[PDB]
């Protein structure tokens, strides 16, 4: 019983080739280089999901910090005032407010500024 | 690299000029390469102007250049030059020969040229 390989190697090879579509030259043509690039690309994608979670936080912090310095308050004290006033809002939504709703963002800063903590 | 070909020696160049000038004086047209026609033209013009007096000294000078051809010998080419060709150019201030460029050869792409006696 001589089992002969055909359509088994080609199908699993073409899957890797399909994944590595849009690469530079031989990186999409040859199966070997395509397989290496897909594995490396998967590693990159894994690492950059974690790094995206951190980098977008940093960007929101930067935007919020800037929005506060125009009014004379700093980020380091704004978050402290937020905690003492029990207000719980993401820096993402706060930055979205300062870019989309200047009046309501200014309302939040006014309350945290001076109103009695709790 | 050794055992190279003799090459385009000075003696070979003089012999080449001699053969083409003898032929162009015998027949009246030569279909050669352009760079060879542009070198044979000088000797052709020099021979024609020196053969305008027809003295025995001028025959001795020409005989150092003429060679035997099919249509004329080395002695009948002398009669053709001194009695038929040269007397025609008796008051022309030079420029007895014209060189014009034909197309490239099929096997070399070199520029051919026809050298003729300008009437």
């Amino acid at each position: 019983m001589r089992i002969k390989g055909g359509k088994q190697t080609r199908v699993r090879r073409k899957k890797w080739l399909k994944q590595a579509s849009g690469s530079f030259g031989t990186r999409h043509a040859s199966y070997k280089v395509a397989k290496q690039t897909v594995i490396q690309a998967a590693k990159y994608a894994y690492r950059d999901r974690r790094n995206k979670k951190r980098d977008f936080r940093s960007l929101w912090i930067l935007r919020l910090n800037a929005a506060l310095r125009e009014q004379g308050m700093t980020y380091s004290v704004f978050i402290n005032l937020l905690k003492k006033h029990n207000i719980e809002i993401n820096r993402k939504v706060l930055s979205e407010l300062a870019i989309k709703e200047p009046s309501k963002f200014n309302l939040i800063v006014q309350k945290v500024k001076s109103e009695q903590p709790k | 690299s050794y055992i190279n070909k003799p090459g385009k020696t000075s003696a070979w160049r003089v012999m080449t000029v001699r053969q083409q000038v003898s032929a162009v004086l015998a027949y009246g047209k030569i279909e050669t390469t352009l760079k060879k026609a542009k070198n044979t033209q000088k000797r052709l013009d020099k021979l024609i102007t020196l053969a305008k007096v027809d003295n025995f000294n001028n025959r001795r000078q020409v005989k150092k250049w003429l060679l035997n051809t099919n249509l004329f010998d080395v002695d009948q080419l002398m009669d053709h030059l001194f009695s038929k060709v040269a007397p025609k150019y008796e008051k022309t201030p030079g420029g007895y020969s014209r060189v014009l460029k034909l197309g490239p050869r099929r096997g070399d792409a070199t520029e051919m040229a026809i050298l003729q006696l300008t009437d």
Binding site: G25 | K101, L102, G103
Partner: protein, 56 residues
């Protein structure tokens, strides 16, 4: 000396970018009309107004 790394199919074409050919300038004969490359005797042996060679 020999290449320690294989040259891709892109560097090859970049080098060949200067290997393109040029169209030789052509003109029209003034007695028969066929195109001949410039400054050269036509196929009829008629250059300008001078009969150079016998007709082809």
């Amino acid at each position: 000396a020999v290449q320690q790394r294989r040259s891709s199919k892109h560097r090859r074409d970049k080098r060949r970018s200067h290997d393109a050919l040029t169209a030789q300038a052509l003109s029209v004969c003034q007695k028969c009309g066929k195109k001949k490359l410039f400054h050269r005797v036509c196929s009829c042996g008629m250059y300008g107004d001078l009969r150079v060679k016998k007709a082809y």
